């Protein structure tokens, strides 16, 4: 249906979590 | 359908990651 953008946004937040984690642990 | 609750959980996580980033970087 239209939850394809929802699936994209989940991947976005998945990448963002790792980005924040590695930035702050650095 | 019944994934709008999933659409709310993804948004609350998408703002939770930002609040975690801001709280820890502070």
């Amino acid at each position: 249906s239209d939850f394809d953008a929802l699936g994209g946004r989940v991947t976005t937040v998945e990448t963002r979590v790792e980005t924040v984690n590695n930035s702050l642990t650095g």
Side-chain angles (χ1 to χ4, degrees), chain A:
Chain A
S1 188
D2 72 27
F3 277 167
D4 309 80
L6 194 68
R9 188 158 66 91
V10 172
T11 301
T12 296
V13 72
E14 176 53 89
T15 296
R16 175 72 165 146
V17 177
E18 296 326 289
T19 300
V20 161
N21 171 56
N22 292 128
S23 296
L24 269 60
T25 192

